Design a protein around this ligand. Structure first.
Ligand SMILES: *[C@@H]1O[C@H](CO)[C@@H](O[C@@H]2O[C@H](CO)[C@@H](O[C@@H]3O[C@H](CO)[C@@H](O)[C@H](O)[C@@H]3O)[C@H](O)[C@H]2NC(C)=O)[C@H](O)[C@H]1NC(C)=O
Ligand SMILES: *[C@@H]1O[C@H](CO)[C@@H](O[C@@H]2O[C@H](CO)[C@@H](O[C@@H]3O[C@H](CO)[C@@H](O)[C@H](O)[C@@H]3O)[C@H](O)[C@H]2NC(C)=O)[C@H](O)[C@H]1NC(C)=O
Ligand SMILES: *[C@@H]1O[C@H](CO)[C@@H](O)[C@H](O)[C@H]1NC(C)=O
Ligand SMILES: *[C@@H]1O[C@H](CO)[C@@H](O)[C@H](O)[C@H]1NC(C)=O
Ligand SMILES: *[C@@H]1O[C@H](CO)[C@@H](O)[C@H](O)[C@H]1NC(C)=O
Ligand SMILES: *[C@@H]1O[C@H](CO)[C@@H](O)[C@H](O)[C@H]1NC(C)=O
Ligand SMILES: *[C@@H]1O[C@H](CO)[C@@H](O)[C@H](O)[C@H]1NC(C)=O
Ligand SMILES: *[C@@H]1O[C@H](CO)[C@@H](O)[C@H](O)[C@H]1NC(C)=O
Ligand SMILES: *[C@H]1O[C@H](CO)[C@@H](O)[C@H](O)[C@@H]1O
Ligand SMILES: *[C@H]1O[C@H](CO)[C@@H](O)[C@H](O)[C@@H]1O
Ligand SMILES: [Cu+2]
Ligand SMILES: [Cu+2]
Ligand SMILES: [Cu+2]
Ligand SMILES: [Cu+2]
Lengths: 372, 372
């Protein structure tokens, strides 16, 4: 079998191209497994592949972390109430050193893995890690099994608010990127997270109209509802199967991969990573720091990690350990290059400090899983 | 009298142009003074204008802050030992929100004012705030009364180190700016600060050759000598009287002023602000975060504040309260615009929280001084 070399403009085959690439990556991962053996190798799976009661087992475990008390010392994050908040808080705390950095991909890989460990160790979860395949939902976000509002979604849309202005995304002094406000605006109307209390932020919440709300200290207590405004137009622009495959096949090195993924500034594109986030609309959906406060975050980054994993396995010799970038957001201010010895941590959320070299592979260090 | 409209290429008259502009600014400030009256109005003065024993009164007060114990809670900055360290620590702590921000100019104005208050309130200083006029020293940094190594300098050059590679200044992914390493390299050889213990950092120290050293936590204890490597070539490139006047006269709004001053990224220029800093070479001279750990910092920023003050007084109606920019370094990540209500503080160094509106004028809020 010879793999696709050029992304198709046809949605139907772009999807199949993606599946081929994934199959190859799956093949590479499995037979390289012949700590981590084929036996104890976990499989992360598309949300759609979960059955009703499996969906709910996951949801319930998450609701469990949203009920268990926070481990973060109150004086460090006064707003944190739950174990779940512990994760949100560390993400807020470290936002300026984990996006547009050399550590971005590996940090989020570790973040979601440790989230998973919390689910298993504290909330008795025994099911698989879920991911959200953007491409399948690119035409109707409201019908996504992740966002349909049912008892098996991560809740759905937010209360509709008429005539919201556009979202204006800034970075540096580049011209804004303009996005539609979606079909919601307010508190989520249904599903398992309808009564979920969002406790932290806003740190930097983009608002319809172009304004931004920012607490003096986004780690203080600010209990409020989760708001969404599902915006299908955004997925259509940045997260279609052709766009996904394009990112994989046109990215010749780790720099181009991660930059294309996140959206290079000034380019008018926010990539699959930005698209996934901003398509949720609402709050913290539109807050780069507080985004894990939206429960769909974990599924989104499941998919982010998948896409990275695929890209790596297309040329494992060159890509397995590939790193580019520094330890500061867009290298502002300048910091040293990230290396295999760079140490990251998730503060009080879970786990301990760990070096980049131990994160590069989904079947070494603490990791032992594959994506189906 | 009609003021210069175009910066002269002649060093001799560029200097006189500067003096005219300063005189005008002085005139505006005084007669606008007709809390702050002409009576209690302080005058900040060129270091050269200080007599021997006045120089030493200032130096001694600084050495006093370098001996009095730190107020910063040990658990917040384990490295801080002295009152002086309190200031360095807050600067390190806030570096990512006080450079390339809307607050940059006003924050540093408040920083040095509160430094001054520490000198007066804790170290019995009663003399004037000094500033370093770069232009007078642009041809021979070693002969500067600030850096001559005598008992009236801020110490002088560092131990000479042969064949140091160039300094390579990065920001974002723009091409590096290359600078010569100067005539020193090591510990300062003489003057009042020869035994001054530099306690904090490095946070991001640029090294000859292009490398950068960064502690895991630059607020922890790392006692070592202050190192300089006086680099006249740098002042010659960025800090000549023509360059100073150019910044004043060619900058039509606050954005262009502050950006030209700091060096716009990608432009190959580091402005009078970068030039002043990097011309000192050494450590923390080449560390954006830790720079106040070099005792010349206060004189440099005296001059920075002067240049701003002059520019403001050229059109006080439009410039007095002018602000542009956000609350994050180069607006990475994006944050709200700075406004007159934006509140800043210097943590434990001195003073309390204060709004931008109270900082805009050297003769309102807490301020009541002029530059001669
Ligand atoms: C947000 O990030 C900052 C910066 O990393 C975190 O501050 C860090 O806090 C921990 C302790 O709270 C420090 O760890 C060290 O622990 C050992 C004891 O095992 C002790 O010997 C050290 O002196 C230190 O306390 C870490 O150095 C410290 N870093 C800084 C710059 O203060 C903070 O915890 C994070 N906030 C949250 C809520 O996670
Ligand atoms: C570096 O900057 C951080 C962020 O500003 C500083 O953390 C801040 O620390 C102070 C107290 O240490 C917090 O002030 C508040 O004081 C009142 C009591 O008057 C209390 O009710 C509040 O809950 C809070 O403790 C401030 O909110 C806090 N901010 C964060 C994000 O933790 C830190 O102090 C700075 N480090 C140094 C050495 O200056
Ligand atoms: C994966 O390996 C299987 C089993 O040998 C093979 O049939 C299939 O063609 C491989 N997939 C790809 C995309 O190479
Ligand atoms: C956005 O901010 C401006 C300036 O503070 C304010 O006047 C306005 O009310 C805000 N606009 C919206 C859409 O709320
Ligand atoms: C931020 O200020 C700039 C001018 O410096 C202005 O163009 C922009 O509209 C402001 N942003 C908002 C949303 O207020
Ligand atoms: C400053 O005011 C004095 C006193 O009237 C005047 O002689 C001088 O010309 C003024 N300076 C400038 C530069 O306008
Ligand atoms: C700079 O860093 C490189 C890579 O770590 C190292 O090999 C080298 O020793 C350093 N160069 C200098 C000039 O010390
Ligand atoms: C940082 O890494 C880049 C490649 O991504 C390399 O070009 C540069 O030399 C590195 N910086 C240093 C000084 O090691
Ligand atoms: C296939 O459908 C996608 C949306 O899923 C479009 O983006 C593409 O142009 C093609 O029509
Ligand atoms: C006057 O002298 C300055 C240095 O002080 C030069 O930069 C300028 O070109 C002129 O020779
Ligand atoms: Cu993140
Ligand atoms: Cu993300
Ligand atoms: Cu500064
Ligand atoms: Cu400075």
């Amino acid at each position: 079998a010879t793999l696709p070399t050029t992304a198709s403009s046809s949605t139907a085959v772009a999807s199949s191209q993606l599946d081929q690439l994934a199959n190859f990556a799956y093949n590479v991962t499995t037979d390289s497994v012949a700590g981590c053996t084929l036996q104890n190798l976990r499989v992360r799976r598309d949300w759609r592949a979960f059955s009703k009661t499996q969906k709910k087992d996951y949801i319930n475990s998450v609701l469990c972390l949203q009920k268990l008390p926070s481990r973060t010392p109150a004086h460090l994050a006064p707003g944190a109430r739950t174990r779940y908040d512990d994760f949100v808080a560390t993400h807020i705390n470290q936002t300026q050193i984990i996006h547009y950095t050399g550590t971005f991909l590996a940090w989020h890989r570790y973040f979601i893995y440790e989230f998973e460990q919390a689910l298993r160790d504290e909330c008795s979860y025994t099911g698989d890690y879920p991911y959200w395949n953007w491409g399948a939902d690119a035409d109707n976000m409201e019908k996504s099994q992740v966002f349909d509002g049912s008892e098996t979604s991560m809740s759905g849309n937010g209360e509709y608010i008429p005539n919201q202005g556009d979202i204006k995304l800034l970075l540096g002094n580049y011209p804004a990127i303009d996005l539609p406000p979606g079909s919601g605006g307010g508190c989520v109307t249904s599903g398992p997270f309808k009564d979920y209390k969002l406790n932290l932020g806003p740190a930097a919440l983009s608002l319809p109209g172009g304004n931004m709300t920012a607490a003096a200290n986004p780690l203080t207590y600010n209990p409020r509802c989760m708001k969404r405004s599902l915006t299908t137009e955004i997925l259509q622009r940045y997260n279609t199967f052709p766009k996904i495959v394009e990112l994989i096949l046109d990215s010749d090195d780790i720099w181009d991969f991660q930059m294309t993924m996140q959206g290079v500034p000034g380019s008018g594109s926010i990539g699959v990573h930005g698209g996934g986030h901003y398509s949720m609309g609402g709050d913290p959906g539109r807050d780069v720091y507080v985004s894990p406060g939206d429960t769909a975050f974990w599924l989104h980054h499941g998919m982010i990690d998948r896409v990275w994993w695929i890209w790596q396995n297309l040329d494992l010799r060159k890509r397995q350990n590939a790193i580019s970038g520094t330890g500061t957001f867009m290298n502002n201010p300048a910091s040293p290059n990230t290396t295999l010895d760079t140490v990251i941590d998730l503060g009080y959320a879970n786990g301990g400090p760990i070096a980049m070299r131990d994160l590069m592979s989904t079947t070494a260090g603490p990791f032992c899983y594959v994506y189906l």
